[PDB]
Amino acid sequence: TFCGQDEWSPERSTRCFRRRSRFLAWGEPAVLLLLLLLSLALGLVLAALGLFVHHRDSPLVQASGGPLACFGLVCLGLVCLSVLLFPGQPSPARCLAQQPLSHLPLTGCLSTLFLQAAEIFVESELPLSWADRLSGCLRGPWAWLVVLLAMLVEVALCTWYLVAFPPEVVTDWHMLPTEALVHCRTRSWVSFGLAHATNATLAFLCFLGTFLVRSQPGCYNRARGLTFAMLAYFITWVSFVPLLANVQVVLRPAVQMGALLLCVLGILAAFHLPRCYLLMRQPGLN
Amino acid sequence: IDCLPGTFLNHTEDEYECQACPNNEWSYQSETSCFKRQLVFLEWHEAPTIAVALLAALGFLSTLAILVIFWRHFQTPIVRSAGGPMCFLMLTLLLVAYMVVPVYVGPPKVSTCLCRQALFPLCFTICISCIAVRSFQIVCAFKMASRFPRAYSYWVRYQGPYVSMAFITVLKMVIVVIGMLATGLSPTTRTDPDDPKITIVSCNPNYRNSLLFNTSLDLLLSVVGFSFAYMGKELPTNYNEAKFITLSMTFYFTSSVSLCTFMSAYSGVLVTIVDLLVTVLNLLAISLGYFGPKCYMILFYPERNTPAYFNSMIQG
């Protein structure tokens, strides 16, 4: 005869008090700190995009890819802006459009760094005839073709995982004493890995294509940035996983949020920041 | 009053106390009757076992083909650059590895757990120490004979790398016996969270602690080998072995880190199959990332096979 799981009445209590709703709100200190980090991320990314549409015709940028590079930068901006679908009152659209819409852009952009790595490898390791053929082929639409291929794969996988297991909201009444925890629940790492597979595959492929290339003698190498950028992504996921498995329930929404930030902050400091810095100093270099 | 799983209302007899239903027998609450705690072990029709079976079959076929092809070209300098019969001492052992995966399927007892714990992990240490000392050759044999010729030239003349590999084998035997004494051969029984009705039976090192009991010196060997190989990634070109060594080491490291991360969280009744998967994968690493390429060079291009070309390249 104990006040219903809606009310948890502490000891020696003749009158019940209702369990207040518990959800990661938009005013917690943590969300403010992470949104400030978001502001920094957006500032640096947009500075990069401006620079990359500034010197578009320059030889340095031409070697980087240009319009594919601009597509990549805009898609990274999109993913960074998609860090605001996690916090707040659980809602069905936000539950169902949180992970897929945050993982699609990363793959749609990382296709481009894979293109760069493939082009380097084409000369670095293959024989001469195939090297010439691939140089003459990949330089053209082939890049946009591969971008589209990755996008189609990612959408198909998203739909499959969706229908198989659409994450839903849940209410727990016995996690903490005086509050009912409402949070969006998932299924182990099934959906996590299913939504993680493709960009991980591409990242590994770039790393193995560009790891061994001899550093350009007395010159900046196009391999160093790609390698150090990919290791950032690998380390980020491998390092947060234990945390997300071993943290307070309520702050769980607040862990995924963080990863996507730090990871991007790595890439924009391993492939785009160096070229952008050079460009800044291109007028002074010559 | 109720009683939580493992203690059943003794409705089969005096019902005042929720006596413990002995042995596998078990009930949730009240629940006069008692169930059975059925044990489960890696099965046949299970798809994952079939996947691993294909993975262990194709790779073994690949090693067998490479064995015959290498053997029938004893004269070509490619086969002679592998160190000689030593390379065969490598290849043969790897077969045993793939030959043992069918020890991980079937009911577990001491008979097969002995193999699982002692035979299979014997080879891996030697088979990675061979590559470790191989990198030792590539770099040191002339680096120290050119950086410390004062004694090195004659000091490593007589105690060829074979003994240095033998000492590592010795350490491996010591550690294996120490661990076997430290624990038992008793098969281990555990409770499956999916439902109390199911339980698990496995060999003793199933615990990741006892599994890591051995993945320390092996990882040390792998890291040292990768370091030395990268040292001569492209500066030397003996027969392009530094490159392949690097690739194989990278694959090993990725497999290790992947398994560690996955087992941090746990996946119920999956650890057996995931473990078998990683073991077979790290065997394929070597079997088709060290030996396959030389099979290709031997059987497609004579650009190396010619005696003149290899007497040209040995000096450089």
From Swiss-Prot, chain A:
Q: Which residues lie on this side of the membrane: Extracellular?
A: 87-101, 166-191, 246-251
Q: Where in the cell is it found?
A: Cell membrane
- Disulfide bridge positions per record: none
Region entry Required for brazzein responsiveness, spans: 1-7
Q: Which residues cross the membrane?
A: 33-53, 66-86, 102-122, 145-165, 192-212, 225-245, 252-272
Record topological domains on the Cytoplasmic side: 54-65, 123-144, 213-224
Complexes and interactors:
Forms homodimers or heterodimers with TAS1R1 and TAS1R2.
Role noted for this protein = Putative taste receptor. TAS1R1/TAS1R3 responds to the umami taste stimulus (the taste of monosodium glutamate). TAS1R2/TAS1R3 recognizes diverse natural and synthetic sweeteners. TAS1R3 is essential for the recognition and response to the disaccharide trehalose. Sequence differences within and between species can significantly influence the selectivity and specificity of taste responses.
Name listed for the protein in its UniProt record: Taste receptor type 1 member 3
From Swiss-Prot, chain B:
Q: Which residues form a coiled coil?
A: none
| Sugar attachment sites | N10
Which stretches are Extracellular in the membrane topology?
107-118, 186-210, 265-267
- The record lists the membrane-crossing segments as 50-70, 86-106, 119-139, 165-185, 211-231, 244-264, 268-288
Q: Which domain of life is it from?
A: Eukaryota
Cytoplasmic compartment: which residues?
71-85, 140-164, 232-243, 289-316
**Function recorded in the entry:** Putative taste receptor. TAS1R2/TAS1R3 recognizes diverse natural and synthetic sweeteners.
Q: Subunit details for this protein?
A: Forms heterodimers with TAS1R3.
- Specify the protein name: Taste receptor type 1 member 2
Tell me the organism: Homo sapiens
Gene from which this protein is expressed: TAS1R2
